[PDB]
PDB file of C-alpha atoms and ligand atoms in Angstrom:
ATOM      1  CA  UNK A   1      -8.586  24.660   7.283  1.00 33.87           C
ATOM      2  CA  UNK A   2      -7.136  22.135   9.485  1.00 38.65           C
ATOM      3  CA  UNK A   3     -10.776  21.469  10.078  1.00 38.81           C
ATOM      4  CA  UNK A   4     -11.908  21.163   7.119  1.00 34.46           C
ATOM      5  CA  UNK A   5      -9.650  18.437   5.885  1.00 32.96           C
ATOM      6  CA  UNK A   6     -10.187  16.528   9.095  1.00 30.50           C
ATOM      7  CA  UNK A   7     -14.010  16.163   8.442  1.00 34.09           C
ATOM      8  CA  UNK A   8     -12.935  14.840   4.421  1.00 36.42           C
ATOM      9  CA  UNK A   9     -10.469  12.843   6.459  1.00 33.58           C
ATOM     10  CA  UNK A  10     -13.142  11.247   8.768  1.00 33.41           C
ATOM     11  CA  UNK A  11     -15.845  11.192   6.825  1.00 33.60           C
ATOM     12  CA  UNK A  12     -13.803   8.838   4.611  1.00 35.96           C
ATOM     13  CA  UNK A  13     -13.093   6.501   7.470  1.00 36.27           C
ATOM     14  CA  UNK A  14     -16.457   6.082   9.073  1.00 36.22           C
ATOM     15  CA  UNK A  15     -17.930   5.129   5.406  1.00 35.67           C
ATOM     16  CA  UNK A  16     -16.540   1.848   6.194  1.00 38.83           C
ATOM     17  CA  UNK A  17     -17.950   1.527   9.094  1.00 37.97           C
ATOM     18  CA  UNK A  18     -21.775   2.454   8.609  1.00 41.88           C
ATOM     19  CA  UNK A  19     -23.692  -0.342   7.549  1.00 41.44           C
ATOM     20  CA  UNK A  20     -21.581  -3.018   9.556  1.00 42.62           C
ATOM     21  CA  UNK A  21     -21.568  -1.144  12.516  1.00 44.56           C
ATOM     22  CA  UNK A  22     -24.503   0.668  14.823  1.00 46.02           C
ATOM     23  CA  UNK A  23     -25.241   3.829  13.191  1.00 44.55           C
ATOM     24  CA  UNK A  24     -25.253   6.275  16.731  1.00 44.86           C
ATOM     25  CA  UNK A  25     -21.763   4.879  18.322  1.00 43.55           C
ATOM     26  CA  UNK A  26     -20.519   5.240  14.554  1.00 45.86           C
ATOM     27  CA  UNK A  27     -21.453   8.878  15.042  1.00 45.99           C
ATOM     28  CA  UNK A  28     -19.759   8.970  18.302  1.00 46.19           C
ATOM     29  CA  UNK A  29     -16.602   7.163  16.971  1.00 41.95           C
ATOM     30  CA  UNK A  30     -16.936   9.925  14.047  1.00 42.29           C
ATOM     31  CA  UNK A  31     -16.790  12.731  16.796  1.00 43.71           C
ATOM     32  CA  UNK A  32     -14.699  11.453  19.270  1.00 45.00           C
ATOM     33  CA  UNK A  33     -11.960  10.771  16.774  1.00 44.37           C
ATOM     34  CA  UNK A  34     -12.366  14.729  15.128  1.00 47.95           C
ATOM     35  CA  UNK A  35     -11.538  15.965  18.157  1.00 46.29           C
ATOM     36  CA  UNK A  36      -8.483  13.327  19.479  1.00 51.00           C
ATOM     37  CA  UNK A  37      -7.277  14.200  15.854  1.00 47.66           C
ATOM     38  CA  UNK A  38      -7.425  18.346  16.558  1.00 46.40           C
ATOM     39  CA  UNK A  39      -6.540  17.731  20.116  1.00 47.90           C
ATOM     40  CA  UNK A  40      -2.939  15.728  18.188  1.00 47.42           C
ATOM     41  CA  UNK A  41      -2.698  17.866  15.224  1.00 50.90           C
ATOM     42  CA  UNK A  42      -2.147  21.133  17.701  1.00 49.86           C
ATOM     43  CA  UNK A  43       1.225  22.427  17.486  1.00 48.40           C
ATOM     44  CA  UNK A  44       2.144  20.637  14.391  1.00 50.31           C
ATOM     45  CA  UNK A  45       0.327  22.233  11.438  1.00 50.74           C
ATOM     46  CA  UNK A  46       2.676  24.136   9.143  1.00 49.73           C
ATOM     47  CA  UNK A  47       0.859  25.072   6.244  1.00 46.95           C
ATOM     48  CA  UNK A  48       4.204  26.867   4.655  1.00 45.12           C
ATOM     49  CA  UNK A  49       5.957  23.666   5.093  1.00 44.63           C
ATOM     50  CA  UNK A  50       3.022  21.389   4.432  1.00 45.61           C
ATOM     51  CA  UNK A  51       5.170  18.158   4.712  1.00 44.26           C
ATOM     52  CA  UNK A  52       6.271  18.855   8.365  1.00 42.51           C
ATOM     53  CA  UNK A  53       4.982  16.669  10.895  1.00 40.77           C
ATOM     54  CA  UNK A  54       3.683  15.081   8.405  1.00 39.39           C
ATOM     55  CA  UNK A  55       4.883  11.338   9.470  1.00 39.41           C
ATOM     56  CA  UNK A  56       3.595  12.564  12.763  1.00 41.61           C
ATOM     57  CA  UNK A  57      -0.069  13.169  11.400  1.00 40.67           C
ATOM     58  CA  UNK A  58       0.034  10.019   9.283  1.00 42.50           C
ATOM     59  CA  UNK A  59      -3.009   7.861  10.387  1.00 42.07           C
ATOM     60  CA  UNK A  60      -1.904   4.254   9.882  1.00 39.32           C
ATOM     61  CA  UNK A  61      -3.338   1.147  10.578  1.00 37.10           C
ATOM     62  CA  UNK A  62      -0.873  -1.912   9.499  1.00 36.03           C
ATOM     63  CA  UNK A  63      -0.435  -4.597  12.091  1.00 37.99           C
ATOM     64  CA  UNK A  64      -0.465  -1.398  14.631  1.00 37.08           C
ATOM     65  CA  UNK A  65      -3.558   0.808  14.931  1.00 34.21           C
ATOM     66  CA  UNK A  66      -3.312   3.968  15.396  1.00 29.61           C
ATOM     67  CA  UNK A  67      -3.941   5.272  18.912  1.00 30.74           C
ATOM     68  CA  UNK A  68      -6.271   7.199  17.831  1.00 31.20           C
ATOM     69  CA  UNK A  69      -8.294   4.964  16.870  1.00 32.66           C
ATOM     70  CA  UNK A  70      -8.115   3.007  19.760  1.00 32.34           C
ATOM     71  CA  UNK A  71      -8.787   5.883  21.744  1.00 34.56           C
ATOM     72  CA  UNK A  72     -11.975   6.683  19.441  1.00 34.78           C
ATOM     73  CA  UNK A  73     -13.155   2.981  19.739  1.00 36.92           C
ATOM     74  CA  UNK A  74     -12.732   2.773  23.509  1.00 37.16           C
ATOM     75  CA  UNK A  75     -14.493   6.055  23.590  1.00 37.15           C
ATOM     76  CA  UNK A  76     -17.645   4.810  21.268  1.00 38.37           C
ATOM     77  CA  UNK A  77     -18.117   1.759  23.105  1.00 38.91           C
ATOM     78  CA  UNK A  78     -16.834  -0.502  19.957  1.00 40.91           C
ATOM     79  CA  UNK A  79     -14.795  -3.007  20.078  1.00 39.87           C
ATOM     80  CA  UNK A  80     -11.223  -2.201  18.376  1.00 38.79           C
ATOM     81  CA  UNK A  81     -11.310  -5.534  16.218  1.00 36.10           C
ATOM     82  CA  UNK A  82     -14.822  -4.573  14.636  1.00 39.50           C
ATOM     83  CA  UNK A  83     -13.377  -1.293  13.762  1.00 41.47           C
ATOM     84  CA  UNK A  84     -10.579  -2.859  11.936  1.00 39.68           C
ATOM     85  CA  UNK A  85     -12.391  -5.486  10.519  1.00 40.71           C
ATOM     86  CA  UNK A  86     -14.261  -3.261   8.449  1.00 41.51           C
ATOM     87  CA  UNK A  87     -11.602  -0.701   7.362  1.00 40.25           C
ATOM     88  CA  UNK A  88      -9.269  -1.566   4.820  1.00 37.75           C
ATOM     89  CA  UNK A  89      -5.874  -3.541   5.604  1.00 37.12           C
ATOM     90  CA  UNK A  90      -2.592  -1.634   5.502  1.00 34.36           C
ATOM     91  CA  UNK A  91      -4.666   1.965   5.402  1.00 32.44           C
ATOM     92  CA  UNK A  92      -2.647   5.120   5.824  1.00 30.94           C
ATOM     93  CA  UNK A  93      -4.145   8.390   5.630  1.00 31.59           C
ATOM     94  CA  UNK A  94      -2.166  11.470   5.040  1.00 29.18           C
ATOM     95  CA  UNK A  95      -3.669  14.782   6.275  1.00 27.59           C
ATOM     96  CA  UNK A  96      -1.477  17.358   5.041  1.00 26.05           C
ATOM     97  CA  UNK A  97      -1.970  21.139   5.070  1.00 25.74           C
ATOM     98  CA  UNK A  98      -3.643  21.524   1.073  1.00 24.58           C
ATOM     99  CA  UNK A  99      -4.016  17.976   0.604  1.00 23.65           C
ATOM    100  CA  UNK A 100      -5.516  14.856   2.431  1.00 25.66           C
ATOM    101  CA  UNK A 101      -4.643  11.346   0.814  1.00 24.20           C
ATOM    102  CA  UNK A 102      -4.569   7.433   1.563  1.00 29.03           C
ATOM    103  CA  UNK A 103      -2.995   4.274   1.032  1.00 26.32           C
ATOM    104  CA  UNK A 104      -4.839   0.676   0.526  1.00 24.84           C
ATOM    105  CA  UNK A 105      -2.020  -2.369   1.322  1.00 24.83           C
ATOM    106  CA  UNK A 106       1.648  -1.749   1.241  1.00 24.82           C
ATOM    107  CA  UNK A 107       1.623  -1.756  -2.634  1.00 28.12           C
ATOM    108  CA  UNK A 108      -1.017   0.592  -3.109  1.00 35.53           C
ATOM    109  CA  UNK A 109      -0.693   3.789  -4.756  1.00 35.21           C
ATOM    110  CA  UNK A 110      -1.368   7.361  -2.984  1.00 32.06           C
ATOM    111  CA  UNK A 111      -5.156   8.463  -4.096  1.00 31.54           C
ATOM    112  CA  UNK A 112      -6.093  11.875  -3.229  1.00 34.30           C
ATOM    113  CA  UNK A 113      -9.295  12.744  -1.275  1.00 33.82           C
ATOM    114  CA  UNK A 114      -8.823  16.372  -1.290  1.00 33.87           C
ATOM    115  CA  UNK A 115      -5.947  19.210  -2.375  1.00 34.28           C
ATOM    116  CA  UNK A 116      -6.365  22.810  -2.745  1.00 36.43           C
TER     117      UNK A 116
HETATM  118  C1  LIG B 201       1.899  21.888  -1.358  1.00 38.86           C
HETATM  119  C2  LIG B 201       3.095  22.842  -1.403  1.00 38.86           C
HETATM  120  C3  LIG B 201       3.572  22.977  -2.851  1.00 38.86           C
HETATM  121  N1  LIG B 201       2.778  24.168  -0.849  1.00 38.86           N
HETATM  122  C4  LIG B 201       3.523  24.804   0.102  1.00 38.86           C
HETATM  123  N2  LIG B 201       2.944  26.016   0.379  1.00 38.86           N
HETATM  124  C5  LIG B 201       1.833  26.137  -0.407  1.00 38.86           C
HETATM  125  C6  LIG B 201       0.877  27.175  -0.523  1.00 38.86           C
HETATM  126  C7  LIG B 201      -0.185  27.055  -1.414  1.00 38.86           C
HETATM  127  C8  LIG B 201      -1.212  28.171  -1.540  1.00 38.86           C
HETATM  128  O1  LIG B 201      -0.839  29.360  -1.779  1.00 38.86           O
HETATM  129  O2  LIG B 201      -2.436  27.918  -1.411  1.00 38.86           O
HETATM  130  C9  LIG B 201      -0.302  25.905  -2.190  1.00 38.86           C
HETATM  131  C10 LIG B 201       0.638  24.881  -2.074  1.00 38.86           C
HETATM  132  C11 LIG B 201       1.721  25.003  -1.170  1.00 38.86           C
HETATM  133  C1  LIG B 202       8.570  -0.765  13.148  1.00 41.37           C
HETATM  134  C2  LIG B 202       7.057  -0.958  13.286  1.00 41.37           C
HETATM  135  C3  LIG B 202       6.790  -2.154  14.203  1.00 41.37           C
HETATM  136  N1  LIG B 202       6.442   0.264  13.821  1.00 41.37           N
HETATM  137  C4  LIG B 202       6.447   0.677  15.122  1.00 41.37           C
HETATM  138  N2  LIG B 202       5.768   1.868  15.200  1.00 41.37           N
HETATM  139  C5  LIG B 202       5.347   2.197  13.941  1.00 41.37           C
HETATM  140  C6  LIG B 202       4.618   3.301  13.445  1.00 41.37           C
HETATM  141  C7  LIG B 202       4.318   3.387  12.091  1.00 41.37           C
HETATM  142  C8  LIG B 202       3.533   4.577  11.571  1.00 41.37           C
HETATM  143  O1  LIG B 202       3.019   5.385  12.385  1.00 41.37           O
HETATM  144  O2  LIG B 202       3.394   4.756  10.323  1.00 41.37           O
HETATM  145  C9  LIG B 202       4.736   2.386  11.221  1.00 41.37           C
HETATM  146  C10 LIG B 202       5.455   1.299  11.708  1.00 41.37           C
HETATM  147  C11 LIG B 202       5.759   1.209  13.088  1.00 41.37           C
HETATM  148 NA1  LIG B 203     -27.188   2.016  17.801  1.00 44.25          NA
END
């Protein structure tokens, strides 16, 4: 459920980072940031009112990174500015109970990774 659209979330993420960055603390990142995001995301899932919380939920990474992903660099022994570096500028990520969905620069439009 929640789940579920976590993994889609993550597995999005880390496909930026495999190739550019070593493949086992990739992994690591990949599961240390699954469960910081579950570990956040508890309390605030509504699936009857999808859209609250959702600001709260909204991974971004402008001129700010997300603490999470701080947290799941520190945690996978990479270095926060070679996690970046290979993600895309201005990202936000939406995880929404039915839907999860990004943003690519602050003009972007809204493409949708998963709904149901
Ligand atoms: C996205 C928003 C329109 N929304 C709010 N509650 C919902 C329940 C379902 C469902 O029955 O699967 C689908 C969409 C829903
Ligand atoms: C005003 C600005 C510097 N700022 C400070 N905290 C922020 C959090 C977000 C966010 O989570 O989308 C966006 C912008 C933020
Ligand atoms: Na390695």
């Amino acid at each position: 459920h929640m789940q579920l659209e976590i993994q889609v979330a993550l597995n999005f993420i880390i496909s930026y980072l495999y190739n550019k960055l070593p493949r086992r603390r990739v992994n690591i990142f990949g599961e240390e940031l699954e469960r910081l995001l579950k570990k956040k995301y508890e309390g605030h899932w509504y699936p009857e009112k999808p859209y609250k919380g959702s600001g709260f939920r909204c991974i971004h990474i402008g001129e700010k990174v997300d603490p999470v992903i701080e947290q799941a660099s520190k945690e996978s022994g990479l270095d926060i500015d070679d996690v970046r570096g290979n993600l895309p500028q201005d990202l936000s990520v939406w995880i929404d109970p039915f839907e999860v969905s990004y943003q690519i620069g602050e003009k972007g439009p809204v493409k949708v990774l998963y709904v149901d």
